[PDB]
mmCIF file of C-alpha atoms in Angstrom:
data_model
loop_
_atom_site.group_PDB
_atom_site.id
_atom_site.type_symbol
_atom_site.label_atom_id
_atom_site.label_comp_id
_atom_site.label_asym_id
_atom_site.label_seq_id
_atom_site.Cartn_x
_atom_site.Cartn_y
_atom_site.Cartn_z
ATOM 1 C CA UNK K 1 7.884 9.532 20.337
ATOM 2 C CA UNK K 2 9.292 12.172 18.004
ATOM 3 C CA UNK K 3 11.889 10.641 15.651
ATOM 4 C CA UNK K 4 11.275 7.435 13.710
ATOM 5 C CA UNK K 5 15.071 6.981 13.441
ATOM 6 C CA UNK K 6 15.516 6.828 17.185
ATOM 7 C CA UNK K 7 12.382 4.680 17.788
ATOM 8 C CA UNK K 8 13.323 2.189 15.231
ATOM 9 C CA UNK K 9 16.794 2.198 16.833
ATOM 10 C CA UNK K 10 15.372 1.145 20.190
ATOM 11 C CA UNK K 11 13.470 -1.611 18.532
ATOM 12 C CA UNK K 12 16.488 -2.916 16.896
ATOM 13 C CA UNK K 13 18.447 -2.811 20.282
ATOM 14 C CA UNK K 14 15.354 -4.404 22.008
ATOM 15 C CA UNK K 15 15.537 -7.252 19.377
ATOM 16 C CA UNK K 16 19.254 -7.634 19.996
ATOM 17 C CA UNK K 17 18.831 -7.846 23.764
ATOM 18 C CA UNK K 18 16.059 -10.436 24.101
ATOM 19 C CA UNK K 19 17.788 -12.832 21.463
ATOM 20 C CA UNK K 20 21.018 -12.251 23.562
ATOM 21 C CA UNK K 21 22.913 -11.662 20.303
ATOM 22 C CA UNK K 22 26.867 -11.279 20.693
ATOM 23 C CA UNK K 23 28.337 -7.791 20.677
ATOM 24 C CA UNK K 24 29.926 -8.303 17.204
ATOM 25 C CA UNK K 25 26.632 -9.267 15.554
ATOM 26 C CA UNK K 26 24.750 -6.509 17.273
ATOM 27 C CA UNK K 27 27.521 -4.006 16.180
ATOM 28 C CA UNK K 28 27.302 -5.276 12.492
ATOM 29 C CA UNK K 29 23.493 -4.906 12.717
ATOM 30 C CA UNK K 30 23.450 -1.315 14.196
ATOM 31 C CA UNK K 31 26.005 -0.395 11.504
ATOM 32 C CA UNK K 32 23.975 -1.713 8.750
ATOM 33 C CA UNK K 33 20.794 -0.065 10.170
ATOM 34 C CA UNK K 34 22.129 3.429 10.205
ATOM 35 C CA UNK K 35 23.713 2.784 6.791
ATOM 36 C CA UNK K 36 20.540 1.823 5.087
ATOM 37 C CA UNK K 37 18.032 3.843 7.081
ATOM 38 C CA UNK K 38 15.374 5.914 5.472
ATOM 39 C CA UNK K 39 12.291 7.297 6.995
ATOM 40 C CA UNK K 40 10.181 6.037 4.159
ATOM 41 C CA UNK K 41 11.270 2.460 4.708
ATOM 42 C CA UNK K 42 10.536 2.416 8.387
ATOM 43 C CA UNK K 43 7.290 4.414 8.646
ATOM 44 C CA UNK K 44 4.678 3.648 11.431
ATOM 45 C CA UNK K 45 1.737 1.881 9.808
ATOM 46 C CA UNK K 46 -0.011 1.190 13.164
ATOM 47 C CA UNK K 47 -3.635 2.343 13.336
ATOM 48 C CA UNK K 48 -4.141 2.796 17.090
ATOM 49 C CA UNK K 49 -7.647 4.452 16.849
ATOM 50 C CA UNK K 50 -9.106 2.112 14.172
ATOM 51 C CA UNK K 51 -11.677 0.364 16.358
ATOM 52 C CA UNK K 52 -12.686 3.232 18.612
ATOM 53 C CA UNK K 53 -16.330 4.112 18.383
ATOM 54 C CA UNK K 54 -17.368 6.932 15.993
ATOM 55 C CA UNK K 55 -18.077 9.344 18.877
ATOM 56 C CA UNK K 56 -14.684 8.958 20.481
ATOM 57 C CA UNK K 57 -13.039 9.183 17.080
ATOM 58 C CA UNK K 58 -14.985 12.308 16.304
ATOM 59 C CA UNK K 59 -14.061 13.850 19.653
ATOM 60 C CA UNK K 60 -10.393 13.134 19.164
ATOM 61 C CA UNK K 61 -10.331 14.432 15.662
ATOM 62 C CA UNK K 62 -11.932 17.702 16.803
ATOM 63 C CA UNK K 63 -8.712 18.361 18.902
ATOM 64 C CA UNK K 64 -6.434 17.917 15.952
ATOM 65 C CA UNK K 65 -5.479 20.501 13.269
ATOM 66 C CA UNK K 66 -2.954 18.897 11.065
ATOM 67 C CA UNK K 67 -0.957 21.183 8.949
ATOM 68 C CA UNK K 68 -0.938 18.577 6.048
ATOM 69 C CA UNK K 69 -4.700 18.952 5.883
ATOM 70 C CA UNK K 70 -4.621 22.643 5.470
ATOM 71 C CA UNK K 71 -3.361 22.656 1.893
ATOM 72 C CA UNK K 72 -5.826 23.749 -0.864
ATOM 73 C CA UNK K 73 -5.722 20.186 -1.862
ATOM 74 C CA UNK K 74 -8.240 19.381 0.914
ATOM 75 C CA UNK K 75 -10.498 22.270 0.601
ATOM 76 C CA UNK K 76 -13.286 20.147 -0.956
ATOM 77 C CA UNK K 77 -12.927 17.246 1.429
ATOM 78 C CA UNK K 78 -16.028 16.507 3.540
ATOM 79 C CA UNK K 79 -15.911 16.553 7.385
ATOM 80 C CA UNK K 80 -15.968 12.868 7.688
ATOM 81 C CA UNK K 81 -13.150 12.500 5.121
ATOM 82 C CA UNK K 82 -10.736 15.063 6.934
ATOM 83 C CA UNK K 83 -11.556 13.516 10.286
ATOM 84 C CA UNK K 84 -10.483 10.081 9.002
ATOM 85 C CA UNK K 85 -7.392 11.426 7.459
ATOM 86 C CA UNK K 86 -6.498 13.291 10.461
ATOM 87 C CA UNK K 87 -6.596 10.197 12.661
ATOM 88 C CA UNK K 88 -3.956 8.438 10.455
ATOM 89 C CA UNK K 89 -1.482 11.326 9.918
ATOM 90 C CA UNK K 90 1.914 10.382 11.612
ATOM 91 C CA UNK K 91 4.898 12.639 12.254
ATOM 92 C CA UNK K 92 8.647 12.274 12.381
ATOM 93 C CA UNK K 93 11.667 14.587 13.031
ATOM 94 C CA UNK K 94 14.624 14.389 10.672
ATOM 95 C CA UNK K 95 18.151 15.289 11.401
ATOM 96 C CA UNK K 96 20.407 17.003 8.929
ATOM 97 C CA UNK K 97 21.860 14.221 6.572
ATOM 98 C CA UNK K 98 19.062 11.822 7.287
ATOM 99 C CA UNK K 99 17.359 10.190 4.350
ATOM 100 C CA UNK K 100 13.554 10.729 3.888
ATOM 101 C CA UNK K 101 13.488 8.713 0.643
ATOM 102 C CA UNK K 102 16.199 6.656 -1.097
ATOM 103 C CA UNK K 103 16.205 6.731 -4.926
ATOM 104 C CA UNK K 104 14.476 3.749 -6.586
ATOM 105 C CA UNK K 105 12.701 2.640 -3.574
ATOM 106 C CA UNK K 106 8.882 2.010 -3.364
ATOM 107 C CA UNK K 107 7.225 5.150 -2.144
ATOM 108 C CA UNK K 108 5.355 4.354 1.054
ATOM 109 C CA UNK K 109 3.474 7.632 1.912
ATOM 110 C CA UNK K 110 3.123 11.195 0.980
ATOM 111 C CA UNK K 111 5.008 13.618 3.067
ATOM 112 C CA UNK K 112 4.433 17.134 4.217
ATOM 113 C CA UNK K 113 7.194 19.450 5.557
ATOM 114 C CA UNK K 114 6.166 21.279 8.600
ATOM 115 C CA UNK K 115 9.558 22.878 9.326
ATOM 116 C CA UNK K 116 13.048 22.661 7.931
ATOM 117 C CA UNK K 117 14.562 22.095 4.572
ATOM 118 C CA UNK K 118 15.437 19.085 2.323
ATOM 119 C CA UNK K 119 17.129 18.589 -0.929
ATOM 120 C CA UNK K 120 16.079 16.369 -3.744
ATOM 121 C CA UNK K 121 19.139 14.495 -5.283
ATOM 122 C CA UNK K 122 19.136 12.486 -8.478
ATOM 123 C CA UNK K 123 22.454 10.863 -8.254
ATOM 124 C CA UNK K 124 24.511 13.565 -6.536
ATOM 125 C CA UNK K 125 22.634 16.342 -8.469
ATOM 126 C CA UNK K 126 20.375 18.697 -6.514
ATOM 127 C CA UNK K 127 17.086 18.891 -8.379
ATOM 128 C CA UNK K 128 15.331 20.799 -5.746
ATOM 129 C CA UNK K 129 15.142 22.371 -2.272
ATOM 130 C CA UNK K 130 12.076 21.815 -0.126
ATOM 131 C CA UNK K 131 10.814 23.708 2.800
ATOM 132 C CA UNK K 132 7.775 24.582 4.934
ATOM 133 C CA UNK K 133 4.481 23.787 3.247
ATOM 134 C CA UNK K 134 5.830 21.573 0.463
ATOM 135 C CA UNK K 135 4.154 18.247 -0.417
ATOM 136 C CA UNK K 136 6.262 15.325 -1.564
ATOM 137 C CA UNK K 137 4.987 12.322 -3.238
ATOM 138 C CA UNK K 138 3.554 10.940 -6.628
ATOM 139 C CA UNK K 139 0.540 11.830 -8.939
ATOM 140 C CA UNK K 140 -0.901 8.404 -9.480
ATOM 141 C CA UNK K 141 -1.356 7.337 -5.738
ATOM 142 C CA UNK K 142 -4.867 5.870 -6.035
ATOM 143 C CA UNK K 143 -3.684 2.823 -8.019
ATOM 144 C CA UNK K 144 -2.595 -0.339 -6.124
ATOM 145 C CA UNK K 145 0.497 -0.383 -8.286
ATOM 146 C CA UNK K 146 3.786 0.065 -6.571
ATOM 147 C CA UNK K 147 5.647 3.446 -7.057
ATOM 148 C CA UNK K 148 9.457 3.703 -7.523
ATOM 149 C CA UNK K 149 10.997 6.882 -6.419
ATOM 150 C CA UNK K 150 13.052 8.735 -8.971
ATOM 151 C CA UNK K 151 15.286 10.601 -6.472
ATOM 152 C CA UNK K 152 16.824 10.889 -3.012
ATOM 153 C CA UNK K 153 15.244 13.299 -0.479
ATOM 154 C CA UNK K 154 17.375 14.191 2.570
ATOM 155 C CA UNK K 155 17.064 16.597 5.404
ATOM 156 C CA UNK K 156 19.352 19.641 5.073
ATOM 157 C CA UNK K 157 18.455 21.076 8.537
ATOM 158 C CA UNK K 158 16.443 19.601 11.354
ATOM 159 C CA UNK K 159 13.015 18.754 9.978
ATOM 160 C CA UNK K 160 9.613 17.982 11.166
ATOM 161 C CA UNK K 161 7.473 15.901 8.745
ATOM 162 C CA UNK K 162 3.912 14.771 8.582
ATOM 163 C CA UNK K 163 2.786 11.783 6.508
ATOM 164 C CA UNK K 164 -0.057 9.434 5.562
ATOM 165 C CA UNK K 165 0.807 5.945 4.301
ATOM 166 C CA UNK K 166 -0.463 5.432 0.715
ATOM 167 C CA UNK K 167 -2.515 2.319 1.862
ATOM 168 C CA UNK K 168 -4.204 4.401 4.636
ATOM 169 C CA UNK K 169 -4.871 7.138 2.037
ATOM 170 C CA UNK K 170 -6.246 4.843 -0.648
ATOM 171 C CA UNK K 171 -8.550 3.138 1.940
ATOM 172 C CA UNK K 172 -9.895 6.636 2.984
ATOM 173 C CA UNK K 173 -10.309 7.807 -0.600
ATOM 174 C CA UNK K 174 -12.403 4.842 -1.501
ATOM 175 C CA UNK K 175 -14.824 5.690 1.288
ATOM 176 C CA UNK K 176 -15.114 9.049 -0.306
ATOM 177 C CA UNK K 177 -15.284 8.566 -4.132
ATOM 178 C CA UNK K 178 -16.554 12.120 -4.796
ATOM 179 C CA UNK K 179 -13.685 13.762 -3.072
ATOM 180 C CA UNK K 180 -11.284 11.134 -4.554
ATOM 181 C CA UNK K 181 -11.905 12.385 -8.012
ATOM 182 C CA UNK K 182 -10.913 15.948 -7.025
ATOM 183 C CA UNK K 183 -7.986 14.708 -4.868
ATOM 184 C CA UNK K 184 -6.625 12.813 -8.013
ATOM 185 C CA UNK K 185 -7.036 15.728 -10.472
ATOM 186 C CA UNK K 186 -5.423 18.291 -8.001
ATOM 187 C CA UNK K 187 -2.603 16.303 -6.555
ATOM 188 C CA UNK K 188 -0.400 16.992 -9.602
ATOM 189 C CA UNK K 189 -1.041 20.670 -8.899
ATOM 190 C CA UNK K 190 -0.051 20.992 -5.200
ATOM 191 C CA UNK K 191 2.602 18.343 -5.352
ATOM 192 C CA UNK K 192 5.816 20.384 -4.757
ATOM 193 C CA UNK K 193 7.797 17.469 -6.199
ATOM 194 C CA UNK K 194 6.946 14.278 -8.043
ATOM 195 C CA UNK K 195 8.876 11.178 -7.159
ATOM 196 C CA UNK K 196 7.131 9.072 -9.755
ATOM 197 C CA UNK K 197 9.854 7.590 -12.047
ATOM 198 C CA UNK K 198 8.273 7.865 -15.468
ATOM 199 C CA UNK C 1 7.636 -7.596 26.662
ATOM 200 C CA UNK C 2 3.826 -7.071 26.123
ATOM 201 C CA UNK C 3 2.475 -5.753 22.895
ATOM 202 C CA UNK C 4 -0.341 -4.474 24.977
ATOM 203 C CA UNK C 5 1.937 -2.475 27.111
ATOM 204 C CA UNK C 6 3.898 -1.228 24.195
ATOM 205 C CA UNK C 7 0.661 -0.067 22.385
ATOM 206 C CA UNK C 8 -0.669 1.475 25.598
ATOM 207 C CA UNK C 9 2.505 3.556 25.836
ATOM 208 C CA UNK C 10 2.062 4.566 22.201
ATOM 209 C CA UNK C 11 -1.461 5.696 23.023
ATOM 210 C CA UNK C 12 -0.200 7.603 25.952
ATOM 211 C CA UNK C 13 2.477 9.410 23.949
ATOM 212 C CA UNK C 14 -0.283 10.289 21.354
ATOM 213 C CA UNK C 15 -2.524 11.809 24.097
ATOM 214 C CA UNK C 16 0.454 13.611 25.637
ATOM 215 C CA UNK C 17 1.852 15.154 22.364
ATOM 216 C CA UNK C 18 -1.684 16.240 21.189
ATOM 217 C CA UNK C 19 -2.374 17.670 24.669
ATOM 218 C CA UNK C 20 -5.815 16.043 24.833
ATOM 219 C CA UNK C 21 -7.948 17.042 27.838
ATOM 220 C CA UNK C 22 -7.940 14.592 30.629
ATOM 221 C CA UNK C 23 -11.493 13.372 30.252
ATOM 222 C CA UNK C 24 -11.025 12.574 26.585
ATOM 223 C CA UNK C 25 -7.833 10.789 27.492
ATOM 224 C CA UNK C 26 -9.558 8.775 30.219
ATOM 225 C CA UNK C 27 -12.251 7.684 27.488
ATOM 226 C CA UNK C 28 -9.388 6.679 25.242
ATOM 227 C CA UNK C 29 -7.618 4.510 27.667
ATOM 228 C CA UNK C 30 -10.898 2.862 28.848
ATOM 229 C CA UNK C 31 -11.840 2.195 25.289
ATOM 230 C CA UNK C 32 -8.250 0.955 24.501
ATOM 231 C CA UNK C 33 -8.368 -1.755 27.311
ATOM 232 C CA UNK C 34 -11.879 -2.639 26.406
ATOM 233 C CA UNK C 35 -11.520 -3.283 22.693
ATOM 234 C CA UNK C 36 -7.916 -4.450 22.819
ATOM 235 C CA UNK C 37 -6.717 -7.659 21.166
ATOM 236 C CA UNK C 38 -3.232 -8.851 20.240
ATOM 237 C CA UNK C 39 -4.495 -9.937 16.793
ATOM 238 C CA UNK C 40 -5.600 -6.331 16.069
ATOM 239 C CA UNK C 41 -2.399 -4.676 17.322
ATOM 240 C CA UNK C 42 0.230 -7.044 15.984
ATOM 241 C CA UNK C 43 3.687 -5.890 15.016
ATOM 242 C CA UNK C 44 4.150 -5.787 11.168
ATOM 243 C CA UNK C 45 7.440 -3.959 11.291
ATOM 244 C CA UNK C 46 10.297 -5.823 9.457
ATOM 245 C CA UNK C 47 13.485 -4.114 10.789
ATOM 246 C CA UNK C 48 15.738 -6.662 8.983
ATOM 247 C CA UNK C 49 14.144 -6.657 5.485
ATOM 248 C CA UNK C 50 17.081 -4.771 3.863
ATOM 249 C CA UNK C 51 20.036 -6.197 5.710
ATOM 250 C CA UNK C 52 22.600 -8.026 3.460
ATOM 251 C CA UNK C 53 21.940 -11.739 2.869
ATOM 252 C CA UNK C 54 24.889 -12.791 4.915
ATOM 253 C CA UNK C 55 24.157 -10.662 7.982
ATOM 254 C CA UNK C 56 20.614 -11.997 7.796
ATOM 255 C CA UNK C 57 21.887 -15.574 7.716
ATOM 256 C CA UNK C 58 24.154 -14.790 10.693
ATOM 257 C CA UNK C 59 21.237 -13.426 12.667
ATOM 258 C CA UNK C 60 18.942 -16.308 11.738
ATOM 259 C CA UNK C 61 21.544 -18.906 13.056
ATOM 260 C CA UNK C 62 21.168 -17.422 16.546
ATOM 261 C CA UNK C 63 17.411 -17.942 16.517
ATOM 262 C CA UNK C 64 15.694 -21.269 17.166
ATOM 263 C CA UNK C 65 12.056 -20.461 17.383
ATOM 264 C CA UNK C 66 9.809 -22.986 19.051
ATOM 265 C CA UNK C 67 7.075 -22.302 16.423
ATOM 266 C CA UNK C 68 9.353 -23.459 13.636
ATOM 267 C CA UNK C 69 10.132 -26.684 15.347
ATOM 268 C CA UNK C 70 6.683 -28.188 14.379
ATOM 269 C CA UNK C 71 6.532 -31.188 12.039
ATOM 270 C CA UNK C 72 4.674 -28.791 9.797
ATOM 271 C CA UNK C 73 8.095 -27.232 8.936
ATOM 272 C CA UNK C 74 9.919 -30.457 8.696
ATOM 273 C CA UNK C 75 10.234 -30.340 4.832
ATOM 274 C CA UNK C 76 10.962 -26.640 4.590
ATOM 275 C CA UNK C 77 14.456 -25.737 3.192
ATOM 276 C CA UNK C 78 17.107 -23.807 4.983
ATOM 277 C CA UNK C 79 16.309 -20.578 3.068
ATOM 278 C CA UNK C 80 12.745 -20.933 3.840
ATOM 279 C CA UNK C 81 13.174 -21.541 7.647
ATOM 280 C CA UNK C 82 15.726 -18.698 7.820
ATOM 281 C CA UNK C 83 13.192 -16.356 6.158
ATOM 282 C CA UNK C 84 10.374 -17.544 8.359
ATOM 283 C CA UNK C 85 12.592 -17.209 11.562
ATOM 284 C CA UNK C 86 13.522 -13.644 10.916
ATOM 285 C CA UNK C 87 9.855 -12.581 10.973
ATOM 286 C CA UNK C 88 8.666 -14.409 13.986
ATOM 287 C CA UNK C 89 7.262 -11.937 16.535
ATOM 288 C CA UNK C 90 6.589 -12.642 20.160
ATOM 289 C CA UNK C 91 4.144 -11.244 22.759
ATOM 290 C CA UNK C 92 3.511 -11.796 26.445
ATOM 291 C CA UNK C 93 -0.150 -11.943 27.295
ATOM 292 C CA UNK C 94 -1.822 -11.156 30.643
ATOM 293 C CA UNK C 95 -4.702 -13.321 32.038
ATOM 294 C CA UNK C 96 -8.070 -12.278 30.682
ATOM 295 C CA UNK C 97 -6.357 -10.469 27.707
ATOM 296 C CA UNK C 98 -7.817 -11.275 24.393
ATOM 297 C CA UNK C 99 -5.579 -12.867 21.621
ATOM 298 C CA UNK C 100 -8.412 -12.757 19.167
ATOM 299 C CA UNK C 101 -11.896 -11.421 19.210
ATOM 300 C CA UNK C 102 -14.651 -13.410 17.255
ATOM 301 C CA UNK C 103 -15.586 -11.910 13.940
ATOM 302 C CA UNK C 104 -12.325 -10.074 13.259
ATOM 303 C CA UNK C 105 -10.137 -10.582 10.367
ATOM 304 C CA UNK C 106 -7.423 -13.130 11.293
ATOM 305 C CA UNK C 107 -3.989 -11.208 11.095
ATOM 306 C CA UNK C 108 -1.407 -13.939 11.836
ATOM 307 C CA UNK C 109 -0.901 -17.540 12.989
ATOM 308 C CA UNK C 110 -0.134 -17.949 16.706
ATOM 309 C CA UNK C 111 1.813 -20.412 18.700
ATOM 310 C CA UNK C 112 1.682 -21.111 22.372
ATOM 311 C CA UNK C 113 5.184 -21.298 24.027
ATOM 312 C CA UNK C 114 3.533 -21.376 27.512
ATOM 313 C CA UNK C 115 0.513 -20.616 29.405
ATOM 314 C CA UNK C 116 -3.119 -21.723 29.041
ATOM 315 C CA UNK C 117 -5.785 -20.123 26.710
ATOM 316 C CA UNK C 118 -9.602 -20.420 26.499
ATOM 317 C CA UNK C 119 -11.297 -20.661 23.165
ATOM 318 C CA UNK C 120 -14.833 -19.166 23.797
ATOM 319 C CA UNK C 121 -17.659 -19.047 21.224
ATOM 320 C CA UNK C 122 -20.330 -16.751 22.429
ATOM 321 C CA UNK C 123 -20.344 -17.902 26.077
ATOM 322 C CA UNK C 124 -19.392 -21.620 25.383
ATOM 323 C CA UNK C 125 -15.752 -22.675 26.219
ATOM 324 C CA UNK C 126 -14.737 -24.953 23.395
ATOM 325 C CA UNK C 127 -11.281 -25.719 24.490
ATOM 326 C CA UNK C 128 -8.208 -24.916 26.574
ATOM 327 C CA UNK C 129 -5.010 -24.337 24.714
ATOM 328 C CA UNK C 130 -1.480 -25.007 26.094
ATOM 329 C CA UNK C 131 2.130 -25.235 25.263
ATOM 330 C CA UNK C 132 2.683 -26.387 21.667
ATOM 331 C CA UNK C 133 -0.682 -25.500 20.261
ATOM 332 C CA UNK C 134 -1.031 -23.879 16.893
ATOM 333 C CA UNK C 135 -3.895 -21.397 16.239
ATOM 334 C CA UNK C 136 -4.823 -20.392 12.771
ATOM 335 C CA UNK C 137 -7.055 -21.208 9.829
ATOM 336 C CA UNK C 138 -7.083 -23.420 6.753
ATOM 337 C CA UNK C 139 -6.985 -20.778 3.953
ATOM 338 C CA UNK C 140 -3.868 -18.786 4.781
ATOM 339 C CA UNK C 141 -2.448 -18.705 1.225
ATOM 340 C CA UNK C 142 -5.560 -17.400 -0.506
ATOM 341 C CA UNK C 143 -5.387 -13.641 -0.395
ATOM 342 C CA UNK C 144 -8.832 -13.340 1.097
ATOM 343 C CA UNK C 145 -10.077 -12.045 4.438
ATOM 344 C CA UNK C 146 -10.656 -14.622 7.216
ATOM 345 C CA UNK C 147 -13.212 -13.721 9.830
ATOM 346 C CA UNK C 148 -12.593 -15.557 12.967
ATOM 347 C CA UNK C 149 -15.175 -17.998 14.417
ATOM 348 C CA UNK C 150 -14.336 -17.573 18.088
ATOM 349 C CA UNK C 151 -12.691 -15.504 20.820
ATOM 350 C CA UNK C 152 -9.339 -16.626 22.260
ATOM 351 C CA UNK C 153 -8.192 -15.280 25.632
ATOM 352 C CA UNK C 154 -5.318 -15.691 27.945
ATOM 353 C CA UNK C 155 -6.235 -17.694 31.199
ATOM 354 C CA UNK C 156 -2.720 -17.350 32.716
ATOM 355 C CA UNK C 157 0.238 -15.522 31.511
ATOM 356 C CA UNK C 158 1.226 -16.716 28.070
ATOM 357 C CA UNK C 159 4.273 -16.548 25.788
ATOM 358 C CA UNK C 160 3.122 -16.422 22.155
ATOM 359 C CA UNK C 161 5.014 -16.571 18.837
ATOM 360 C CA UNK C 162 3.282 -15.575 15.578
ATOM 361 C CA UNK C 163 3.893 -14.815 11.983
ATOM 362 C CA UNK C 164 1.551 -12.265 10.205
ATOM 363 C CA UNK C 165 -0.322 -13.768 7.319
ATOM 364 C CA UNK C 166 0.876 -11.162 5.020
ATOM 365 C CA UNK C 167 4.491 -12.021 6.071
ATOM 366 C CA UNK C 168 3.824 -15.888 5.713
ATOM 367 C CA UNK C 169 2.251 -15.585 2.297
ATOM 368 C CA UNK C 170 5.219 -13.532 1.189
ATOM 369 C CA UNK C 171 7.782 -16.190 2.085
ATOM 370 C CA UNK C 172 5.596 -19.091 0.925
ATOM 371 C CA UNK C 173 5.635 -17.300 -2.481
ATOM 372 C CA UNK C 174 9.312 -17.551 -2.584
ATOM 373 C CA UNK C 175 9.291 -21.262 -1.785
ATOM 374 C CA UNK C 176 6.567 -22.869 -4.080
ATOM 375 C CA UNK C 177 7.481 -26.481 -3.522
ATOM 376 C CA UNK C 178 7.330 -26.082 0.252
ATOM 377 C CA UNK C 179 4.202 -23.915 0.035
ATOM 378 C CA UNK C 180 2.271 -27.097 -1.276
ATOM 379 C CA UNK C 181 3.231 -29.325 1.611
ATOM 380 C CA UNK C 182 2.326 -26.441 4.018
ATOM 381 C CA UNK C 183 -1.082 -26.202 2.618
ATOM 382 C CA UNK C 184 -1.405 -29.952 2.963
ATOM 383 C CA UNK C 185 0.224 -30.773 6.394
ATOM 384 C CA UNK C 186 -1.154 -27.948 8.268
ATOM 385 C CA UNK C 187 -4.340 -29.915 9.372
ATOM 386 C CA UNK C 188 -2.076 -32.403 11.078
ATOM 387 C CA UNK C 189 -0.684 -29.465 13.263
ATOM 388 C CA UNK C 190 -3.605 -26.989 13.378
ATOM 389 C CA UNK C 191 -4.633 -27.395 17.041
ATOM 390 C CA UNK C 192 -7.419 -24.935 16.528
ATOM 391 C CA UNK C 193 -9.140 -23.638 13.356
ATOM 392 C CA UNK C 194 -10.789 -20.261 13.473
ATOM 393 C CA UNK C 195 -12.308 -20.108 9.990
ATOM 394 C CA UNK C 196 -16.045 -19.597 10.107
#
């Protein structure tokens, strides 16, 4: 459950087993996997509760209290909107040295640090240190336009992150135009660091 | 491995880590088995998307996917079939389990490696599908939503292969000349057409 890195690893190992791939190929695959890994590139986009009835969805959301959604950024969101966001927030642990985002990659979500610390590196230059309560992403998220990240973000210590994929977020925001306008013009505010290259 | 069993485990993790009371959890599992369908829970992960071209080629050479053996793909180039092969998913289905529920957006094209399936519209069994049948629609390329015109359910245990439509469109984009024949020849192979 807890770490995308380990979950995706099991998936890759599963894949390898059922196609009965030789050890040498497997080894090359596993090697390349860890080498290129970033949380941002392997996020969980499944939406398990999508088709549950509203009552069941309401009852589930009532038992959640996601830290991401406690930011001032969400103060003006309606109940329906927060409930829908809460149901698509995912989590992952990050180990020290693990890449959250690799520079120049398309941003896949906005990320929230529950615990731990991360560094933002342009090249090998530390632009920033992030910790508890920080929000990582970009300022022009509502557009369908792809977003290239302007730096690397790596876990310094063990980290716990929450996130919402940009596609999940845009879809909810459209359902709630009024709050969308406030989200847009306040994201730049609470955004601890902006990955938008440009 | 069953996608259904996989997703069920994911739902149970979710219940467990959020410490949901047991009556809510029961409602969730019941509603999960009740509304479940493969089409709505397919695997869109692309674990191999960023591997080097040569490692990808070495992986593809070890695959020979039954889906891709259809005459529909006869004219596709090597690069094209390699691309397609690397994003073919599979799922084992249990008897009575829904592949597709009528009225849902079609998410992939599906291929029957084994087993028997019932195409049911309302309460009328239109057909029984079996090894080698291709289930899909006639649009596919067009970026639009396709609402399905029938249910498809497993009668026996079935092996299915499938390629998500998003995935298919993306490869077809890279192989224009083949894309044209695909759009033509598909009728010849489409065993069942779900488009309303």
